[PDB]
Design a protein around this ligand. Structure first.
Ligand SMILES: Nc1ncnc2c1ncn2[C@@H]1O[C@H](COP(=O)(O)OP(=O)(O)OP(=O)(O)O)[C@@H](O)[C@H]1O
Ligand SMILES: Nc1ncnc2c1ncn2[C@@H]1O[C@H](COP(=O)(O)OP(=O)(O)OP(=O)(O)O)[C@@H](O)[C@H]1O
Ligand SMILES: [Mg+2]
Ligand SMILES: [Mg+2]
Lengths: 152, 152
């Protein structure tokens, strides 16, 4: 039954964390902030199929912004507009989350806000002296939902 | 509690039908097949935030195609390409579903396919002689998901 798998997933929201279902950084379709929204760039982004594209600068672990396909609506390819212009203008808020975060809580924060995408990062206390925040990947509402509705 | 909301939705997956959670035709963002994809049309489609756009011809009930935002990737607004060109090119399959269809069966049909959008239609028996199919609206995976996870 579908109901059994759904209920089981709901139960498992208590146990599992965001790291269990996240899309790790190496599997994330991202883009540099130094990009130029000419026709080719826009077509790449659009055929990627992803609604939300994390924007990094320098290194992929350095997520500095978040691009929506929706933002490309009024963008003319002929103008060759720098992406920095769009990310500065819209300035969609970035949402972060620790790796040990349980799925029920993540579902709660997703529900409560307009947020659908959080950035999974880990507290790197295994120094190398002083610690820092280490971006592991991304987690979306669809991940949680799929963990709910998947068969098992 | 969230677990209980989810379990309850699971319990309601067989009681409720797709008609109960569909987005009715009058609330659907749609587009004519006679449309030309100039800059204004593409910007209007992109601005709407909808990934999948029902393509109607004649009346809005006559859903003949399904447009994907993804299908606008390689389209240049300067060409003023007929939308018919793109719909004929990709030809995304149309999925129809009867209004009395339960949410569990709908969910099962969604999972075992790439399809995420069905057209909710019923059988208008008040003849007027020969019966026919009347398009009521659209239903997506997101709809049944929202049914599952929402509070009650
Ligand atoms: N930029 C990205 N690169 C790689 N994977 C992504 C990206 N954005 C989302 N995903 C992954 O896609 C899966 C489904 O996510 P989601 O459906 O929210 O993305 P989407 O299809 O762009 O959004 P929507 O479902 O609203 O269209 C998730 O597992 C998520 O990790
Ligand atoms: N073309 C459309 N016009 C109006 N409402 C729509 C349309 N497509 C979907 N919806 C509604 O929006 C809600 C969410 O649907 P869904 O999230 O699948 O659309 P989407 O966000 O464009 O797709 P995705 O989430 O995969 O990016 C559903 O309740 C559905 O009924
Ligand atoms: Mg998706
Ligand atoms: Mg959506």
């Amino acid at each position: 039954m579908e109901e059994l798998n759904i209920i089981q997933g709901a139960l498992e929201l208590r146990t599992k964390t965001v790291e269990d279902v996240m899309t790790p950084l190496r599997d994330c379709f991202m883009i540099t902030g130094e990009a130029i929204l000419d026709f080719n760039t826009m077509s790449e982004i659009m055929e990627s199929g992803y609604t939300r594209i994390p924007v990094f600068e320098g290194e992929r672990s350095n997520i500095v912004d978040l691009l929506f396909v929706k933002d490309l609506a009024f963008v003319d390819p002929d103008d060759c507009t720098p992406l920095k212009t769009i990310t500065k203008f819209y300035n969609h808020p970035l949402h972060f989350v620790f790796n040990d975060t349980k799925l029920d809580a993540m579902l709660e924060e997703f529900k409560k806000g307009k947020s659908h995408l959080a950035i999974v990062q880990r507290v790197n206390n295994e120094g190398e002296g002083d610690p820092f925040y280490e971006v592991l990947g991304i987690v979306t509402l669809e991940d949680v939902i799929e963990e709910i509705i998947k068969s098992e």
